[PDB]
Amino acid sequence: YPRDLIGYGNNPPHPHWPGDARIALSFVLNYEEGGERCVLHGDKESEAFLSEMVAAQPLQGVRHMSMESLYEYGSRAGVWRLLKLFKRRNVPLTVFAVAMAAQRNPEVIRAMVADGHEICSHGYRWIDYQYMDEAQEREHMLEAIRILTELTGQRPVGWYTGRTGPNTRRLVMEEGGFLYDSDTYDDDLPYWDPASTAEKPHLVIPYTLDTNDMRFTQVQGFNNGEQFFQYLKDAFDVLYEEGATAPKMLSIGLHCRLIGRPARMAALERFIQYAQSHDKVWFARREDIARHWHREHPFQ
Template sequence: PCWPGGARVAVQFVVNYEEGAENSVLNGDRGSEAFLSDMVGAPSHPARAMAMESLYEYGGRAGFWRLYRLFTERRLPLTVFGVARAMEANPAAVEAMMTAGWEIASHGLRWIDYQSVPESVEREHIAEAVALHTRLTGARPLGWYQGRTSPNTARL
């Protein structure tokens, strides 16, 4: 490849923005998130799991803004894999992403496992994610990364 300035290495930065769209009884789910956290092997609880909720809440309240400052102060571009419901829950973060000129790719509607979700429901979630992303950013997503996929995801 022939990169600008004779560069020999290309680096891509991606921030997954998922906070607020994870499994939670507050989101109408049967249990709390158990897949991705600092608590390895955490079980899903059929009630509010305050420790898990706190981990996700911190990301949207403080973690994102730390990364935002680091990248904008250095004028570094990045891609955001934004879960539509998480973006909807924090419009200030979406505005900051857009002001910074960051690319916002869709990371689906919810941060849930689609492995055993009926195809019709996953199809509805994809359509809703595109519509919500479009409403929040003013443009349809040009990139898509569903995350925890099903056998139907790529085709849908």
């Protein structure tokens, strides 16, 4: 049976975070705009996911103008608002950068690098990989690595597809250059993938679909900032209390086209401020968590 339902069980390791933090926070900014479904991108259909058009369907072989425009908000305006927020609050980001999206807006990528944020690969295209053949999925991976290396000067050491298929994580681990991937939702702590060997260990840093602004546009989620703030506050409070004895981590997922809207950004800043008002909080990039785990908890 190939699934690990057990994990650490009732005995998770103490992460011993920097500063003996009671909680580690990983803010993640997705950058997908310009890489989504679009006939202009070589796709058979328009995009339908994660936009204000909460009931949208993909349209075959045509452009959906409103949908394109909603995505353009993220790359034109939302991204800059959010970069300014993270700079103002002095909180690092891991950016889940879709390589095609990056290619179409190199100046924002440069700004992200300038501000010291990690550029993590979010795949070549922002599409569903469920049914993609292995050779083609591998080709996309290599191309994503190539593009991100050229744009930033350094290869990505993290990987996150999101809409994975049965081969995705295997291919990541086979490529061999990734310190971690985040294509799981299965824990409150990093862990070494069962496929790890002494020679090739691979760290998993689980991500999130719940403390994630994508829920502002899904059939169940949040309709305002107050609700999102309360949700994040609760997660923080529970984990921070656990961290009196057993610290964990919390990921916070963000999208430029979504929380980049001023109506939603207020709650994000309020949460950052709330977190910052507590001592023993570690605000980390995913790569930093990965390098910490290699040092503190090496694979055995």
